[PDB]
């Protein structure tokens, strides 16, 4: 009863792109993180700030859950302080991060013969994204002196790029589903708790 909707975020049928990561709020329920990390292989579970062994015996004000899909080698960039294409122009975590990061290989779900190209990622931006900033602008990136004028060409490129998830890819490029739990402890009756 009144268990937090953790199932509809992790086991959701279709994930969002990393550039348009999906945030689901968790409040007014009890949380049981024992139905999350099912060990397995290649699955990563790293808690930054709050230790995992006490997650079931802690109370928080809110729990935000960000969800997206990346590749294997870009999993390590989803961490506080790290830099890279994803960490700079797609999804940035603050330095005072207090939460956890879960990731698991989803090659059987987000890959198909011929290629699943529905997942996108931002390649260029004028500046790095601040923590928890979401940019969904499809404006042509201008790397040169001439205004691109809505079209691209010489020193003008598109900011979005398709991943290309094939079942025959390497582990480093297979699609990985990532869910980031951010725990917020404000100044109100703490709603989300554990056993």
């Amino acid at each position: 009863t009144n268990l937090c909707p953790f199932g509809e975020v992790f086991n959701a049928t279709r994930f969002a792109s990393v550039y348009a990561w999906n945030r689901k709020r968790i409040s007014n329920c009890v949380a049981d993180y024992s139905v999350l990390y099912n060990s397995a292989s290649f699955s990563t579970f790293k808690c930054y700030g709050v230790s995992p062994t006490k997650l079931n015996d802690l109370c928080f004000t809110n729990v935000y859950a960000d969800s997206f899909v990346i590749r294997g080698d870009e999993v390590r960039q989803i961490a506080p302080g790290q830099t890279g294409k994803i960490a700079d122009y797609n999804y940035k975590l603050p330095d005072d991060f207090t939460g956890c990061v879960i990731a698991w290989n989803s090659n059987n779900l987000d890959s198909k013969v011929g290629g699943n190209y529905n997942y996108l990622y931002r390649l260029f931006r004028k500046s790095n994204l601040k923590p928890f900033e979401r940019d969904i602008s499809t404006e042509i990136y201008q790397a040169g002196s001439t205004p691109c004028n809505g079209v691209e060409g010489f020193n003008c490129y598109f900011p979005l790029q398709s991943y290309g998830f094939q079942p025959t890819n390497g582990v480093g490029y297979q699609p990985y589903r990532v869910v980031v739990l951010s725990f917020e402890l404000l100044h109100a009756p703490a709603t989300v708790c554990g056993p």
Epitope: P52, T53, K54, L58, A79, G81
Partner: antibody, heavy 120, light 109 residues
């Protein structure tokens, strides 16, 4: 008061398996997470594995994830570590430790340890 | 992961002298670090938890302090019972819990 007694160490040849146990006494076992941490003679301290309270989404370490298996038993107040396909570099003195903290995790109480030598 | 580096790796001090050991982290871990004492053959013992908190039973001569990426354990008055190795371990980004390489305190004569 708080006592942790390890048992099960000995001789293992490469590829085989071995089970280690850790009997606790002096606290409510079902309320603390447990840790397995090894120390190779010559090297320093190395964390191996951790199990939550009661037993849930156990967290391992790399070069161990698919090989070892940590479990527990609140009835017998015992913590178990089943090592499979032991390699030469797993030879070490093993300790079991407790968890503590509001958030965070530090090892407040340790056991005397037990020696595991893996060689052909 | 997070790599911890102790300094120095070994030292030689006399009784009553103030001893200082530093521990550096590859990234900010706030105050989520602890210290352990281990004598040859015996099991480790907890000394300081969460940067600057003294564990019960530990004498007041030990004191930890730090913030950010650089922490430091100091012994105000070294004693013969303190001939042991000292490890720093961070507990911010877990798992895995990462230990230091160890700082062996040696009694001079």
């Amino acid at each position: 008061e708080v006592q942790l007694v390890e048992s099960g160490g000995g001789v293992v040849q490469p590829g085989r398996s071995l089970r280690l146990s850790c009997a606790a006494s002096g606290f409510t076992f079902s309320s603390y997470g447990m840790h397995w941490v090894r120390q190779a003679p010559g090297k320093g301290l190395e964390w191996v594995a951790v199990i939550w309270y009661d037993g849930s989404n156990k967290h391992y370490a790399d070069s161990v994830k698919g090989r070892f298996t940590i479990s527990r038993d609140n009835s017998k107040n015992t913590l178990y570590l089943q090592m499979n396909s032991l390699r030469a570099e797993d030879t070490a003195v093993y300790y079991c430790a407790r968890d503590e903290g509001t958030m965070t995790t530090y090892f407040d109480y340790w056991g005397q340890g037990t020696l595991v030598t893996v060689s052909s | 992961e997070i790599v911890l580096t102790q300094s120095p790796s070994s030292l030689s001090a006399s009784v009553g002298d103030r001893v200082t050991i530093t521990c550096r982290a590859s990234q900010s871990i706030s105050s989520y670090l602890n210290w352990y004492q281990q004598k040859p053959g015996k099991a480790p013992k907890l000394l300081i938890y969460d940067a600057s908190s003294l564990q019960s039973g530990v004498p007041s001569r030990f004191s930890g302090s730090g913030s950010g990426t650089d922490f430091t354990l100091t012994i105000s008055s070294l004693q013969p019972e303190d001939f042991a190795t000292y490890y720093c371990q961070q507990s911010y980004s877990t798992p895995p819990w990462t230990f230091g390489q160890g700082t062996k305190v040696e009694i001079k004569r």
